[PDB]
From a paper:
Nck proteins are composed of three N-terminal SH3 domains and a single C-terminal SH2 domain (reviewed in Ref. 3). Nck recruitment is required for complete T cell activation, and its inhibition dampens TCR signaling by reducing Zap70 phosphorylation. The objective of the present study was to initiate development of an inhibitor of the Nck/TCR interaction, specifically by blocking binding of the first SH3 domain in Nck (Nck1-SH3.1) to the PRS in the CD3ϵ subunit of the TCR. During our studies, it became clear that Nck-SH3.1 exhibits conformational diversity and can swap half the number of its residues to form a dimer.
During the crystallization efforts that led to the monomeric apo- and peptide-bound Nck1-SH3.1 crystal structures, seven more structures were determined that all exhibited domain swaps, leading to dimers. The swaps are located at the exact same position in all structures (i.e. Lys-36 in the n-Src loop), clearly visible based on the high-resolution electron density. Dimers are formed by exchange of the C-terminal 25 residues, almost half of the entire SH3 domain. The interface thus generated contains a short anti-parallel β-sheet encompassing the CD3ϵ sequence 36KSWW39. Superposition of the Nck1-SH3.1 structure with the bound CD3ϵ peptide shows that domain swap and tight peptide binding are mutually exclusive. The C-terminal half of the SH3.1-binding sequence would get into steric conflict with the second SH3.1 domain in the dimer. All of the dimers are swapped in the same manner, but with different juxtapositions of the second SH3.1 domain with respect to the first. The hinge at Lys-36 provides quite a bit of flexibility that allows the dimer to pack in many different crystal lattices. Indeed, the hinge region varies over ∼6 Å within the superposed ensemble, and the distal loop covers a distance of ∼8 Å in the dimers. Given the large number of swapped, independent chains present in different crystal forms and grown under different conditions, swapping seems an intrinsic property of this SH3 domain.
Residue numbers in the entry:
A (entry chain A), B (entry chain A): 5 to 62
The structure:
Amino acid sequence: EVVVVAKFDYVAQQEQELDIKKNERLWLLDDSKSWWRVRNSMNKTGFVPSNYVERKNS
Amino acid sequence: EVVVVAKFDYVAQQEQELDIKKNERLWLLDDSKSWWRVRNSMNKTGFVPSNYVERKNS
Ligand code: NA
Ligand code: NA
């Protein structure tokens, strides 16, 4: 239901990303959640909700 | 270089997401950028930087 508008162009850097143009309108998915891209100890990469992770102090 | 720690478990909902467990340590990729998942007018889905889009008021 939530529509967003591109403020700037973005050229996708990876196949999971999307190319967008300034002023393009898009559906915002996943209840408007913010994501971080992470890599685990087995070298698998993917997106997780940014609220579920925090920087480590060590 | 930046390591994050899972605060909670997360079960991935899509193949682009990652399953993580509480207390797991992960590499944070993409200069710690936040992402939104969007769908365009051609029904292609992907992640874009959340700073590059904003909610539309119409
Ligand atoms: Na966080
Ligand atoms: Na934004």
